[PDB]
């Protein structure tokens, strides 16, 4: 529902969303900074990584 | 030399496809060497200086 | 009794986001598990702030809460709190009542906050080890051949020292080594009582070993089998085990095992220490023919866990005993982890008796759920002797 | 491009000879290195080379 | 490391003994056939 | 004087679960 959502990268602003899986997006080398947050278990491109969850506002 | 560049690019693409087949999703690791899955690799662990 | 009958009624689950478990984590100032905020009034007897309304839970720092194993254990170990209060109400002088689980988490009553880095593990405590198995006759075999020199030698030295910490005064131990020749590492030459002084001698001698020579498993195992058959000195007359700390090889030494224990009266536990490309097949074979287990220690972080799991194997004949194995045992005098002075602790193991009506599974029912325990302070005993 | 492949297939014999001499050189130096530094890169450092 | 070994090495020593015997009576034949000038020989 | 109890070498014991059969 309201797991931290976004589509862009710079402002980190929420969006409409569904589904019980919500994730985090970050660079593998720069671990201590979440680039993008949303829902589902999407596939990163480079050099990003995805860490998915199970509950609301698990990604933090 | 554009022809040689194109041929090299084609060979690189083919080798990239072969490498994707070989090592797709296999190069993951955990900071703790005792855990071999994403679910297991969670929480904290003790390291020694 | 209540822990056994509640575990059987437990239905194993796989999700907990919908059904969050409520418990108080001792080591705190999270989805999937709700935490409690207790009142923590001051009380006598104990020298800290306690709360008689629920039981606290201690989870080791290297064990991740929220796993399917931990969360399931946090659910069925919630009916214990209603038995904790009934014991305290019946005996107001009741000190810490605890449940040391085989998962790793300890649930104790009454609730109090936990006491640098926290290295406490309930499965390594003397009161847990004494109730998880019978006294033993350990005999450590250390591979000091040339191939173990370097990183895998200092892992072996650490592992042996960490293994000696799981032996009480009722267990008898000795440490040997072999490289084309088997000999003792210390001045003992036979099984010793493994008290605090004797264990320190073995720990000092183990740290002074050098890796050089040709490995020979036949002479190392013949030496071990001939040291477990002495019967000239004081022994335990109980579990006879051999722990082999090596890396790998190609020798199976089936003729030694077919000659010294044809009836398999001695268990063999094998450890493969370090990262290497040597064969592990012979190492795993010795652990299966003899009723033992095979363990892998690839780094320094796996030493603590793998050097205490052999008590799961040693407890198999204890579970199959039945109610005969349910005998209350009292430990030596020691200092409480939660500072309370000198105490002695009672002990009673808990068995997994799920599906006991049909008696058909017997697959994970050979292990113990955990160990029960109640603390008795020495001041309580001193009050009965004016 | 096709002329290049034709020349390669025509000279594949000398190509194989040249690639085999390099392999022999690598084998010789690998054996020498195995003799000199074999089983010696085992120091007390926590990381393994 | 540190003078360790196994069975395969124990065999390779004897195989190398045999190899030494062979390249000796084959240098002797050439030595007592043409009396060492060429670089390869 | 050691403990009088002793629990080992039970015939009904499974002992078919080592650490190498699985791997
Ligand atoms: C006391 O003993 C009982 C049985 O005697 C024991 O209850 C048993 O618990 C296990 C879980 O450890 C249940 O196993 C079910 O079936 C498989 C086997 O594990 C699981 O599926 C996957 O299993 C792999 C293990 O290789 C695991 O990594 C993975 O996460 C699992 N899930 C996946 C892939 O989605 C099932 O999840 C698991 N649970 C089910 C089907 O609900 C047994 O079924 C249980 N047996 C009985 C009779 O209930 C109990 O845990 C013991 N007590 C304690 C404290 O451990
Ligand atoms: C394992 O996890 C759960 C965490 O609380 C517990 O499951 C809950 O058990 C309650 C008691 O059995 C249930 O409440 C009652 O259940 C009975 C079923 O027989 C019914 O009357 C009603 O459903 C309910 N009574 C009411 C609401 O008045 C809970 O419904 C149930 N929760 C879920 C999600 O199933 C288990 O008890 C717990 N195990 C242990 C040992 O504590
Ligand atoms: C005690 O150890 C000895 C030596 O291992 C066992 O063997 C005896 O050794 C002594 C001295 O040589 C002699 O009595 C005999 O040669 C051996 N046999 C017997 C029956 O004594 C001995 O058996 C062990 N046990 C006892 C009770 O002595
Ligand atoms: Ca060796």
Quoted resolution (Å): 2.9
* Whether residue C67 has its Cβ less than 6 Å from ligand 1: no
Distance CA C110, CA C81 (A): 9
Write out the DSSP string of C312-365: HHHTHHHHTT-GGG--------EE-SSS-SEEEE--EEEE--TTTTTT---SST
* Omega within 30 of 0 (cis) for the link into C110: yes
CA D26 to chain centre: 4
Helices marked H in A1-60: none
Distance CA E5, CA C142 (A): 18
Distance CA C298, CA C301 (A): 8
Tokens linked to C367 = 């292990």
Q: Judge: C150–D44 Cβ closer than 8 Å, yes or no.
A: yes
Kindly list the residues from chain C whose CB atom is less than 8 angstroms away from the CB atom of residue F2. Answer: 135, 170, 236-238
CB atoms within 10 A of CB C240: 22
Distance CA C283, CA C293 (A): 10
Kindly list the residues from chain A whose CB atom is less than 8 angstroms away from the CB atom of residue C15. Answer: 54
Tokens linked to C2 = 């209540």
- How near does any CA of chain D get to the CA of C56, in Å? 38
Closest C-alpha to C293, from C243, C226, C220, C256: C243
Chains F and B touch (3+ CB pairs under 8 A): no
Nearest CA in chain D to C153: D44
Q: Name the neighbours of E, counting chains with at least 3 Cβ pairs within 8 A.
A: C, D
Q: Judge: B33–C299 Cβ closer than 8 Å, yes or no.
A: yes
Measure CA of the first residue to CA of the last residue in chain F; give whole Å: 43
SS3 C249: coil
Closest C-alpha to C235, from C195, C274, C192, C273: C192
Helix axes C2-9, C68-76, angle to 10 degrees: 120
**Is C105 in contact with C121 (CB distance < 8 Å)?**
no
Contacts of C51 (CB under 8 A, 6+ apart): C38, C39, C40, C41, C110, C111, C112
| H or E segment and range at residue B8 | helix B2-22
Per-residue H/E/C for C39-80: CCEECCCCCCEEECCCCEEECCCCCCCCCHHHHHHHHHCCCC
Nearest CA in chain E to D36: E1
DSSP code for C117: -
Distance CA C35, CA C383 (A): 39
Structure obtained using: cryo-EM
| C223-C225-C228 Cα angle (round to 5) | 110
SS3 C240: coil
| C268-C269-C270 Cα angle (round to 5) | 115
Chain C interface, best mutation among A21, A54, A59, by max C CB count within 10 A? A54
Residue F6, CA atoms < 13 Å, CB-side half-sphere: 12
Distance CA B17, CA B14 (A): 5
**Is C71 in contact with C59 (CB distance < 8 Å)?**
no
Name C176's bridge partners. C141, C184
Q: What number does the ligand 1 atom closest to the CA of C355 have?
A: 48
**Is C100 in contact with C373 (CB distance < 8 Å)?**
yes
Q: Judge: C64–B48 Cβ closer than 8 Å, yes or no.
A: no
Distance CA C58, CA D40 (A): 46
Place of tokens 């004797």: C198
Tokens linked to C89 = 């109400």
**Is C145 in contact with C215 (CB distance < 8 Å)?**
yes
Distance CA A19, CA A58 (A): 13
Residues of chain A contacting C, Cβ within 8 Å:
20, 53-58
Helix axes C151-164, C196-206, angle to 10 degrees: 180
SS3 C255: helix
**Is C41 in contact with C31 (CB distance < 8 Å)?**
no
Chain E interface, best mutation among D34, D39, D48, by max E CB count within 10 A? D39
Distance CA C261, CA C79 (A): 46
Distance CA C139, CA C190 (A): 10
Closest C-alpha to F20, from C4, C281, C315: C281
Tokens linked to C247 = 């890396």
| E4-E10-E15 Cα angle (round to 5) | 140
Ligand nearest to the CA of C353: 1
Burial of D19 from C-beta contacts in 10 A (0-12 / 13-18 / 19+): exposed
**Is C3 in contact with C369 (CB distance < 8 Å)?**
yes
Distance CA E13, CA E16 (A): 5
Closest Cα to atom 45 of ligand 1: C12
Helices marked H in chain C: 2-9, 68-76, 81-90, 126-132, 151-164, 196-206, 217-227, 254-260, 281-289, 303-306, 310-314, 316-319, 378-383
Contacts of C337 (CB under 8 A, 6+ apart): C115, C120, C125
Tell me which residues of chain B, numbers 7 to 46, contact chain C at a CB-CB cutoff of 8 Å: 32-34, 39, 42-46
Task: Give me Rg for the CA atoms of chain D.
Answer: 20
Closest C-alpha to C189, from C180, C261, C197, C198: C198
**Is C76 in contact with C105 (CB distance < 8 Å)?**
no
Per-residue H/E/C for D1-49: CHHHHHHHHHCHHHHHHHHHHHHHHHHHHHHHHHHHHCCCCCCCCCCCC
Burial of C264 from C-beta contacts in 10 A (0-12 / 13-18 / 19+): middle
Virtual torsion, Cα C65, C67, C68, C69, nearest 10 deg: -60
Distance CA C285, CA C269 (A): 10
| E15-E18-E23 Cα angle (round to 5) | 125
| Cβ < 6 A, ligand 2 pocket | C 6, 10, 19, 75-76, 78-79
Task: Give me Rg for the CA atoms of chain C.
Answer: 23
């Amino acid at each position: 529902r309201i797991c931290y959502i976004h589509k862009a990268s710079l402002p980190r602003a929420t969006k409409t969303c569904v589904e019980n899986t919500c994730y985090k997006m970050f660079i593998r080398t720069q671990r201590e900074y979440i680039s993008e947050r949303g829902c589902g278990c999407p596939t990163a491109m480079w050099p990003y990584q995805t860490e998915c969850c199970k509950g609301d506002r698990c990604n933090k | 030399i554009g022809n040689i560049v194109i041929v090299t690019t084609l060979l690189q693409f083919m080798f990239a496809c072969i490498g994707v087949q070989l090592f797709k999703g296999k190069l993951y690791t955990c900071s703790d060497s005792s855990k071999q899955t994403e679910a297991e690799c969670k929480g904290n662990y003790i390291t020694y200086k | 009794l209540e822990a056994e009958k509640v575990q059987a009624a437990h239905q194993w689950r796989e999700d907990f986001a919908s059904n969050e478990v409520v418990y108080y984590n001792a080591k705190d100032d999270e989805p999937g598990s709700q935490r409690i905020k207790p009142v923590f009034i001051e009380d006598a007897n104990f020298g800290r702030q306690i709360s008689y309304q629920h039981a606290a839970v201690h989870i080791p720092t290297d064990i991740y809460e929220g796993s399917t194993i931990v969360l399931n254990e946090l659910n069925w170990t919630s009916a214990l709190d209603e038995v904790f209060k009934k014991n305290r109400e019946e005996d107001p002088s009741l000190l810490w009542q605890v449940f040391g689980s085989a998962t790793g988490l300890a649930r104790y009553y009454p609730a109090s906050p936990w006491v640098k880095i926290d290295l406490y593990d309930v499965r390594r405590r003397p009161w847990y080890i004494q109730g998880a198995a019978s006294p033993k006759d350990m005999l450590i075999l250390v591979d000091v051949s040339g191939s173990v020199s370097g990183l895998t030698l200092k892992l072996i030295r650490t592992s042996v020292s960490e293994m000696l910490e799981t032996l009480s005064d009722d267990d008898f131990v000795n440490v040997a080594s072999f490289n084309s020749n088997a000999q003792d590492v210390s001045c003992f030459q036979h099984l010793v009582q493994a008290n605090v002084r004797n264990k320190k001698v073995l720990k000092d001698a183990v740290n002074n070993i050098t890796a050089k020579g040709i490995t020979d498993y036949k002479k190392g195992f013949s030496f071990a089998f001939e040291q477990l058959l002495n019967y000239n000195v004081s022994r335990a007359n109980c579990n006879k085990i051999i722990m082999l700390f090596t890396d790998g090889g190609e020798e199976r030494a089936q003729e030694i095992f077919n000659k010294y224990n044809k009836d398999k009266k001695v268990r063999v536990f094998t450890f493969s220490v370090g990262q290497h490309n040597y064969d592990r097949g012979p190492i795993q074979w010795m652990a299966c023919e003899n009723k033992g287990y095979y363990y892998e220690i690839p780094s320094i972080g796996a030493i603590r866990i793998n050097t205490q799991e052999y008590l799961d194997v040693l407890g198999r004949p204890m579970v199959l005993a039945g109610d005969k194995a349910k005998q209350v045992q009292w430990t030596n005098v020691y200092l409480d982890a939660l500072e309370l002075g000198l105490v002695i602790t009672g002990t009673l193991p808990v068995f997994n008796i799920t599906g006991q009506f049909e008696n058909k599974t017997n697959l994970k029912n050979q292990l113990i759920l955990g160990v029960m325990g109640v603390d008795v302070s020495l001041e309580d005993i001193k009050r009965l002797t004016p | 491009l096709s002329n290049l492949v034709a020349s390669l297939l025509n000279s594949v014999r000398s190509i194989a000879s040249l690639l085999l001499l390099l392999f022999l050189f690598i084998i010789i130096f690998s054996l020498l290195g195995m003799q000199l530094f074999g089983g010696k890169f085992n120091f007390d450092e926590m990381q393994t080379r | 490391p540190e003078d360790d070994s196994n069975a395969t090495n124990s065999n390779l020593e004897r195989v190398e003994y045999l190899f030494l015997i062979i390249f000796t009576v084959e240098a002797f034949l050439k030595v007592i056939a043409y009396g060492l000038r060429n670089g390869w020989n | 004087k050691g403990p009088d109890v002793c629990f080992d070498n039970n015939v009904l014991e499974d002992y078919t679960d080592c650490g190498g059969v699985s791997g």
